[PDB]
Design an enzyme around this catalytic site. Structure first.
Site, PDB file in Angstrom:
ATOM      1  N   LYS B  85       0.880  -1.238  -0.210  1.00 46.93           N
ATOM      2  CA  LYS B  85       0.079  -0.087   0.014  1.00 46.93           C
ATOM      3  C   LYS B  85       0.866   1.341  -0.060  1.00 46.93           C
ATOM      4  O   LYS B  85       0.865   2.186  -0.755  1.00 46.93           O
ATOM      5  CB  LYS B  85      -0.827  -0.067   1.355  1.00 46.93           C
ATOM      6  CG  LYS B  85      -1.782  -1.366   1.172  1.00 46.93           C
ATOM      7  CD  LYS B  85      -3.186  -0.665   1.407  1.00 46.93           C
ATOM      8  CE  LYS B  85      -3.863  -1.456   2.551  1.00 46.93           C
ATOM      9  NZ  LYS B  85      -3.631  -3.064   2.601  1.00 46.93           N
ATOM     10  N   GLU B 107     -10.308   6.870   3.624  1.00 43.81           N
ATOM     11  CA  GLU B 107     -11.197   5.955   4.640  1.00 43.81           C
ATOM     12  C   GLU B 107     -10.581   4.585   4.969  1.00 43.81           C
ATOM     13  O   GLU B 107      -9.775   3.932   3.993  1.00 43.81           O
ATOM     14  CB  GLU B 107     -12.632   5.988   4.237  1.00 43.81           C
ATOM     15  CG  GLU B 107     -12.899   4.457   3.610  1.00 43.81           C
ATOM     16  CD  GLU B 107     -12.746   4.401   2.177  1.00 43.81           C
ATOM     17  OE1 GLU B 107     -12.093   5.252   1.709  1.00 43.81           O
ATOM     18  OE2 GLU B 107     -12.877   3.168   1.640  1.00 43.81           O
ATOM     19  N   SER B 364       2.735  -9.234   0.224  1.00 46.85           N
ATOM     20  CA  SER B 364       2.055  -8.056   0.359  1.00 46.85           C
ATOM     21  C   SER B 364       2.388  -7.190   1.611  1.00 46.85           C
ATOM     22  O   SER B 364       2.258  -6.052   1.778  1.00 46.85           O
ATOM     23  CB  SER B 364       0.579  -7.909  -0.225  1.00 46.85           C
ATOM     24  OG  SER B 364      -0.005  -9.048   0.571  1.00 46.85           O
TER      25      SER B 364
HETATM   26  C1  PLP Z   1      -3.908  -4.000   1.756  1.00 50.05           C
HETATM   27  C2  PLP Z   1      -3.487  -5.105   1.707  1.00 50.05           C
HETATM   28  C3  PLP Z   1      -3.937  -6.198   0.847  1.00 50.05           C
HETATM   29  C4  PLP Z   1      -5.050  -5.747   0.027  1.00 50.05           C
HETATM   30  O1  PLP Z   1      -4.701  -5.068  -1.093  1.00 50.05           O
HETATM   31  P1  PLP Z   1      -5.145  -5.173  -2.469  1.00 50.05           P
HETATM   32  O2  PLP Z   1      -5.533  -3.808  -2.894  1.00 50.05           O
HETATM   33  O3  PLP Z   1      -6.233  -6.521  -2.678  1.00 50.05           O
HETATM   34  O4  PLP Z   1      -4.060  -5.427  -3.527  1.00 50.05           O
HETATM   35  C5  PLP Z   1      -3.187  -7.521   0.657  1.00 50.05           C
HETATM   36  N1  PLP Z   1      -2.098  -7.711   1.469  1.00 50.05           N
HETATM   37  C6  PLP Z   1      -1.739  -6.735   2.293  1.00 50.05           C
HETATM   38  C7  PLP Z   1      -0.302  -7.124   3.133  1.00 50.05           C
HETATM   39  C8  PLP Z   1      -2.243  -5.631   2.377  1.00 50.05           C
HETATM   40  O5  PLP Z   1      -1.671  -4.644   3.341  1.00 50.05           O
END
Ligand code: PLP
Ligand code: PLP
Ligand code: NA
Ligand code: NA
Lengths: 237, 375, 375, 237
Positions: B85, B107, B364
């Site tokens: 993010k 938000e 992620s």
């Molecule tokens: C926010 C987040 C997601 C969800 O994000 P997408 O918009 O679906 O890519 C997935 N994994 C992590 C670690 C996140 O912080």
């Protein structure tokens, strides 16, 4: 669709503006709403603005009253059953009219006696499907004309719109846009204010919804009676 | 418009007329920035020296042991914030600036976004106000601490849209994922596309060959599409998206609208969604709240439509296991959300050990935030 | 011995005879590895693709605003684990392997080390047992989850030493900082020396000129010396170490033995310490438990003796403020321990705004762990 | 220093091993310890092993008894006051003897009547300062000789040591290391076991400390009396 036309006819032959009060369908619950509308109508209302589930609380209220998308069309027919002349407008969101087919929806609308429909989230730039399907089933597609309006936007709403414009007044006329209807009206002063302003009438949004929530425990109607009566009188001339 | 607001039949700009000028201005500001070597320079520079980019490509060698599949990992958790993010959030901010904005609107439910926005706001000096409901902690403080102004989601998205509606002249809206109305979906991808680009160059170095497939979880599709993008043209490498199956699809308590929803119209876009039989938007269960978006990226719905991308699912237990497994065998703690993706790769190899496959899952984020729950 | 177990008059190997062979073997294993291009290769490689190295050098531009001093930041928080610790822990492990070890012995109070060891153990596959007392949470789980075997400090250090004493043939001891008996102090520095090396090359690029001074907090001196090392020969650049002043030196409730202790003999070394009037070892207060070592690195005591390095102090409030400040102006959350260092840099510039100085503080870690307390 | 010499003289003229029981100084508290030693001594003990604040609990115990490094030297003198012959050994850690000057410490030792001192954390490789200062003030520097011993380590402890070696037996003799004293002795069997093994005697570490903690509420002495008596008899021949 031609219902509005008629309304703006006798309304002019009386040099008076139109006063369309908005309200949520089956807000209090169901029978009460079926009443509020009855009153609103004989109170003076020329047209109608019914929204399907302040306005927020209205929805929350209705919801907690088991009001399925099918329960309203029942009311829409019932209402129309007793009032064959008063025009009826519908406030909806894409998904609802999109849900079970776009046409199917509009087709069901002509079946109950709805005159115009405005999709709060469908801009003139993505209304084709909704516009055509509406016209096809003889339904006036009402588009909102906001402040940050343009010339093309003004030209688009004047050409695609029908029944009436949801509000300039000179250009909208120059473009031949359905009788523009101004909609922050809470006092008789604003009502007559718009009429004189050039608008074929005004719409009292949440303005009336409040009167309904400020007496939730006192079945209110009298308040709506007067509130409307006043507002209406203000339009006369 | 200048760009194509549609990916097949998914997309559009289903928002009140009032917000159209805002959107139009945004696409214009983006198309301009997109070609500005400067904007790029800064963004790149910022990504580099502040966020941490490039992210490492760790090659798991313990979990794969016993099988014939090599698992590579994209360390999106080694990035400032511990989640992908804090990547597009910067470019959006830089954009807001290029546009002349002095405030940011956002938000969140868990707060993951509320932080990224806050952190991005603070550095770039922008008045930021986040919208949260009842799910509202460690981040509320984290957010406030960072100057942020803490104030369901579909509901939280309305309040936000409402605000912006009358203020866009100064305040800008920071969409949380690759969803929403045009040009957001297209914007967030571009500001998340380096993930795959780096992945490509990296793998090409470590194995002078593209991966067999690339797995990535999907809550909104921002991280997924970020990884996919640069590989779309590479037909050989497969793209697998993973939606949260929650307690199980057959239970109804899951979160995979892409493959079990039903195209509808909400969030200013036209794509699959979690709604009742008569159109009412619903929630999306999953152990990882970071994946509770009741919809998905229109480009994901399209990518799967023409069969370019395959989307699978994974339950809670599945992720919970793939979670503990990474800890014990690689000394890495992944996000319960990231687990899902990695949890599918495991199954992929476990089911066919003799199968020679070189895949890479997208991590992620770190799991430090989900440690309390997973406990 | 092969190396010099002494830094001036500080150092030595004050441990029971039984542990001497262990130590002797270790120095031999280290001197050997030190010259092995392979060992280096792996260590380097591991540091790169797993830990995240190199770390970024963010250049603070908001906090410094209003003054004439440019503050550069070494992102040791952008490293796997969120602390410089997960750096030397690897090289020690690699060492343990090169030696033929199958188990690792360690201890911790807060758990920061217990994790690094655990994470390093898991990846390298080594049976690891950590020693903790009553201060024993999020990491106990974090540690166990990572296969680790959870079982004051000076006391916790004994239990550890005791164990190792009879087992060193298979199990190896992982010292938590650049303290303890030879060759630990020398070992941990080498396995933490890339921090400064990177800092040098980096700054040389961003400003084609070495920094004026380099600030680094000191709990044991591992992170500090890691930053100092490569700059020692550079007389122009100053080296400032910062010990926790707790509630204030004049209160007695602080943790700066380097400048307010009194050379004694414990922890297998001869250096300044926190002891009573008649030799009893004491504690070292500070808001950040990650800085509760009642002693310091012998090379730090020596560096300050010949006046090569300057050591200052900073109270709790001072750090607490420098903490919140970084959040709000840079969108970065530092460790309460790292604050101390950064907290001194602030004062350095605040006191002489017109003073043109280019300094760089060492951010040894993220503050996510201290968020609960700082709250 | 010459005290030990004497002990190993009359001890040999009786073809019997030495039995040195260890104990923490002022363990129970102060007066009790001053007694335990009294008993240990007349019970049969040839030498003494007093440690300054299982063994762990011994320290914890003493500590909670306000036993400052000054309170012991008081006991050390008192004890020596009634027993001018029995050799006294001291178990310490670098910091304590280093605290207020290395020599100052050793000098204070000769002043109270201490014969030998062994620094648990000072290896032969870092004892110079402690060795010299000890010899200087006529104090036998006892060094521990563990299992993983070497030839050089064996040569170092035989040359630097004095008074007695804290335990091979053949090499230690070949090197001329002070009478080696074996120290896991809890049963009379091990006592005589060592003697025959070649050791000039044995030391019962915590072995006796327990007897003191297993009767903490019952001022025990009788148990120490016998326990020692037994152990001692086992050394005779
Ligand atoms: C926010 C987040 C997601 C969800 O994000 P997408 O918009 O679906 O890519 C997935 N994994 C992590 C670690 C996140 O912080
Ligand atoms: C462990 C730690 C320290 C203390 O380490 P030194 O050995 O004193 O360098 C300082 N900062 C952080 C973030 C730490 O994790
Ligand atoms: Na989703
Ligand atoms: Na310290």
């Amino acid at each position: 669709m031609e219902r509005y036309e008629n309304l703006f006819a006798q309304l002019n032959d009386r040099r008076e503006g139109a006063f369309v009060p908005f309200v949520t369908l089956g807000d209090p619950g169901i029978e009460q709403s079926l009443k509020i509308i009855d009153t609103l109508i004989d109170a003076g209302a020329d047209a109608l603005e019914l929204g399907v589930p302040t306005i927020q609380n209205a929805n929350l209220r209705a919801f907690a009253a088991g009001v399925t998308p099918a329960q309203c069309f029942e009311m829409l027919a019932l209402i129309r059953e007793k009032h064959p002349t008063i025009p009826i407008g519908l406030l909806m969101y894409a998904n609802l009219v999109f849900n079970n087919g776009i046409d199917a929806f509009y087709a069901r609308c002509e079946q109950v006696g709805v005159d115009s429909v405005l999709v709060a989230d469908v801009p003139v730039e993505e209304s084709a499907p909704f516009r055509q399907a509406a016209l096809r089933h003889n339904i006036a597609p009402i588009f909102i004309c906001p402040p940050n309006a343009d010339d093309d936007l003004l030209r688009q709403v004047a050409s695609y719109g029908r029944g009436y414009t949801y509000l300039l007044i000179e250009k909208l006329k120059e473009y031949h846009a359905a009788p523009a209807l101004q909609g922050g009206i809470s006092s008789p002063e604003q009502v007559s204010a718009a009429v004189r302003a050039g608008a074929a009438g005004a719409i009292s949004g949440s303005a009336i919804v409040k009167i309904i929530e400020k007496n939730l425990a006192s079945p209110m109607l009298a308040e709506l009676r007067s509130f409307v009566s006043a507002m209406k009188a203000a339009s006369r001339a | 418009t200048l760009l194509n607001p549609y990916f097949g039949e998914f997309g559009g700009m289903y928002v009140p007329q009032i917000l159209m000028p805002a959107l139009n201005q945004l696409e214009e500001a983006f198309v301009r920035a997109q070609k500005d070597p400067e904007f790029q320079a800064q963004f790149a520079d910022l990504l580099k020296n502040y966020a941490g980019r490039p992210t490492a490509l760790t090659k798991c060698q313990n979990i794969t042991a016993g099988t014939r599949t090599t698992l590579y990992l994209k360390r999106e958790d080694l990035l400032h914030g511990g989640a992908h993010k804090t990547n597009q959030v910067l470019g959006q901010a830089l954009l807001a600036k290029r546009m002349g904005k002095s405030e940011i609107i956002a938000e969140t439910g868990a707060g993951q976004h509320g932080v990224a926005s806050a952190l991005a706001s603070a550095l770039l000096g922008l008045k930021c106000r986040i919208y949260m409901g009842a799910k509202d902690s460690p981040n509320v403080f984290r957010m406030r601490l960072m100057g942020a102004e803490v104030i369901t989601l579909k509901d939280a998205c309305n309040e936000a849209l409402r605000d912006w509606s009358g203020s866009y002249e100064t305040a800008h809206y920071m969409l949380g994922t690759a969803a929403g109305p045009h040009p957001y979906p297209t914007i967030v991808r571009e500001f998340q596309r380096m993930i795959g680009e780096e992945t490509k160059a990296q793998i090409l170095d470590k194995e002078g060959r593209l991966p067999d497939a690339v797995i990535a979880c999907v809550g909104g599709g921002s991280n997924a599409i970020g990884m996919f993008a640069d590989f779309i043209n590479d037909t050989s490498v497969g793209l697998i998206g993973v939606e949260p199956g929650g307690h199980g699809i057959e239970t109804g308590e899951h979160g995979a609208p892409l493959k079990h929803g039903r195209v509808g119209i909400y969030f200013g876009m036209k794509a699959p969604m979690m709604q009742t039989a008569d159109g009412q938007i619903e929630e999306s269960y999953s152990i990882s709240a970071g994946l509770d978006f009741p919809s998905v990226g229109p480009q994901h719905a399209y990518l799967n439509s023409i069969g370019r991308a395959d989307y699978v699912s994974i339950t809670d237990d599945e992720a919970l296991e793939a979670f503990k497994t990474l800890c014990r065998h690689e000394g890495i703690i992944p996000a319960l959300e990231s687990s899902h993706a990695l949890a599918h790769a495991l199954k992929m190899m476990r089911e066919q050990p003799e199968k020679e496959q070189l895949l890479v899952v997208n991590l992620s984020g770190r799991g430090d935030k989900d440690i309390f729950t997973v406990h």
